[PDB]
């Protein structure tokens, strides 16, 4: 499992979304987590929405096993569908 995060270093809710993946990475051995800047790196929600195939407006901006999965919102609901299911 590979989970990739676009822009931690820029806002607290994006950090919380990153931290959720890192927290899961702490909890298990299957689950690997990756952080990539967008505000530093010169990337934006206009780039991310094209790559993802879906018009995005705001954060979070996460991908799981190379696929777009929102982040803190999607990820909490996804984690819940496993651990609270």
């Amino acid at each position: 499992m590979q989970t990739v995060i676009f822009g931690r270093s820029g806002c607290p809710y994006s950090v919380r979304a990153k931290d959720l993946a890192e927290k899961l990475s702490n909890e298990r051995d299957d689950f690997q987590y990756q952080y990539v800047d967008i505000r530093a790196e010169g990337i934006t929600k206009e780039d991310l929405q094209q790559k993802a195939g879906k018009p995005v407006e705001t954060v979070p901006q996460i991908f799981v096993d190379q696929q777009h999965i929102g982040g803190y919102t999607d990820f909490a609901a996804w984690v819940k569908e496993n651990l609270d299911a």
Binding site: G10, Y13, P60, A76
Partner: peptide
């Protein structure tokens, strides 16, 4: 006159899925 602008918080910090935050470059 001379004032400060403050935001009240009725909800708790509960960790479960806020979908937005307008963050970028």
């Amino acid at each position: 006159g001379a004032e400060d602008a403050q935001d009240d918080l009725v909800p708790s910090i509960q960790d479960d899925g806020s979908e937005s935050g307008a963050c970028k470059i």
